[PDB]
């Protein structure tokens, strides 16, 4: 089973990251998870898990294997779901305030697939240019914009849509 | 009561445009509506209205008052909800295949507020640059990315969120 890196930042829509995490486990992926403090509060205002093969890394722990290119090059990809506008900026500018930012920088320099789920509205020029820079650098930017193709009925149907889009980015087969 | 221009293009999420239309009427706005053929099919695969003060214009009718700057300068703003990637491109490049594109060009040259609701995923560089050009030109780009701040329960709660964001762009008071 391959390795996947998943970072969850403090932005509205932390649920997308939870759902993505659950699916990766179900599909038998060894997940290395990074959860920001900002993300912890959000999932509440918006822990005990029976999930398998998940290794958690402290958002402040730069000794983490994920912070080493030599280690990261063996992963199938890196997800930052959801990716706050702040994290988007930090990665686009190479400013590293936490492990998550570092992992983005490592993915970029090691050319490891990097996927971001942005959830903001409206967009200002900075948001657009940061996403453009990520994109031009090989990264993939996915806005949390569910569609109505499949005639969704619940919020759950829209979450799965976005999660399915994220998995398709890395060609991971699924049934959502 | 002021005038509002609303264009609905063929893109997944035509529902956002329907909801926005209903709210504008309820808030007592004289709405000039343009509906693409592409949009008609979509709302089905995804007419008889008891709505008041709505004047409909043919997507191909360039004689429409909306195609005249002298007329458009008196509107509070122009909505293109939802705005397909094609329409986004046409307006950003000044290519006019239909009335809707023309109205975007008129709004831009007459500096009439222009608001677009984009629904696409993932974004490629073209999508980003088109949105950036619209933005730099004074237009406002709103991605159809509902948030979970208000703890939504139904798809309806997410539609209202996005619709509320669109109204806030033009400072129109509402209770959604």
From Swiss-Prot, chains A, B:
<dbReference type="GO" id="GO:0106141">
    <property type="term" value="F:flavin prenyltransferase activity"/>
</dbReference>
<protein>
    <recommendedName>
        <fullName>Flavin prenyltransferase UbiX</fullName>
        <ecNumber>2.5.1.129</ecNumber>
    </recommendedName>
</protein>
<comment type="function">
    <text>Flavin prenyltransferase that catalyzes the synthesis of the prenylated FMN cofactor (prenyl-FMN) for 4-hydroxy-3-polyprenylbenzoic acid decarboxylase UbiD. The prenyltransferase is metal-independent and links a dimethylallyl moiety from dimethylallyl monophosphate (DMAP) to the flavin N5 and C6 atoms of FMN.</text>
</comment>
<feature type="binding site">
    <location>
        <begin position="84"/>
        <end position="87"/>
    </location>
    <ligand>
        <name>FMN</name>
    </ligand>
</feature>
<keyword id="KW-0808">Transferase</keyword>
<feature type="binding site">
    <location>
        <position position="119"/>
    </location>
    <ligand>
        <name>FMN</name>
    </ligand>
</feature>
<keyword id="KW-0637">Prenyltransferase</keyword>
<feature type="binding site">
    <location>
        <position position="36"/>
    </location>
    <ligand>
        <name>FMN</name>
    </ligand>
</feature>
<comment type="similarity">
    <text>Belongs to the UbiX/PAD1 family.</text>
</comment>
<keyword id="KW-0285">Flavoprotein</keyword>
<dbReference type="GO" id="GO:0016831">
    <property type="term" value="F:carboxy-lyase activity"/>
</dbReference>
<dbReference type="Pfam" id="PF02441">
    <property type="entry name" value="Flavoprotein"/>
</dbReference>
<dbReference type="InterPro" id="IPR036551">
    <property type="entry name" value="Flavin_trans-like"/>
</dbReference>
<keyword id="KW-0288">FMN</keyword>
<dbReference type="InterPro" id="IPR003382">
    <property type="entry name" value="Flavoprotein"/>
</dbReference>
<feature type="binding site">
    <location>
        <position position="165"/>
    </location>
    <ligand>
        <name>dimethylallyl phosphate</name>
    </ligand>
</feature>
<feature type="binding site">
    <location>
        <position position="149"/>
    </location>
    <ligand>
        <name>dimethylallyl phosphate</name>
    </ligand>
</feature>
<dbReference type="InterPro" id="IPR004507">
    <property type="entry name" value="UbiX-like"/>
</dbReference>
<feature type="binding site">
    <location>
        <begin position="10"/>
        <end position="12"/>
    </location>
    <ligand>
        <name>FMN</name>
    </ligand>
</feature>
């Amino acid at each position: 089973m391959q390795k996947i890196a998943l970072c969850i930042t403090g932005a509205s829509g932390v649920i997308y990251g939870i759902k993505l995490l659950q699916v990766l486990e179900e599909l038998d992926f060894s997940v290395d998870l990074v959860i920001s403090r900002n993300a912890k509060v959000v999932l509440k205002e918006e822990v005990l898990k029976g999930l398998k093969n998940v290794r958690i890394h402290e958002e402040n722990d730069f000794t983490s294997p994920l912070a080493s290119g030599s280690r990261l090059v063996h992963y199938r990809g890196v997800y930052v779901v959801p990716c706050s506008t702040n994290t988007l900026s930090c990665i686009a500018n190479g400013i590293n305030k936490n492990l998550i930012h570092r992992v983005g920088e490592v993915a970029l320099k090691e050319r490891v697939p990097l996927v971001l789920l942005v959830r903001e509205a409206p967009y200002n020029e900075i948001h657009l240019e940061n996403m453009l820079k990520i994109t031009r650098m090989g990264g993939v930017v996915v806005p949390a914009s569910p569609a109505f193709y499949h005639k969704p009925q619940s919020i759950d149907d829209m979450i799965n849509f976005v999660v399915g889009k994220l998995l398709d980015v890395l060609r991971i087969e699924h049934n959502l």
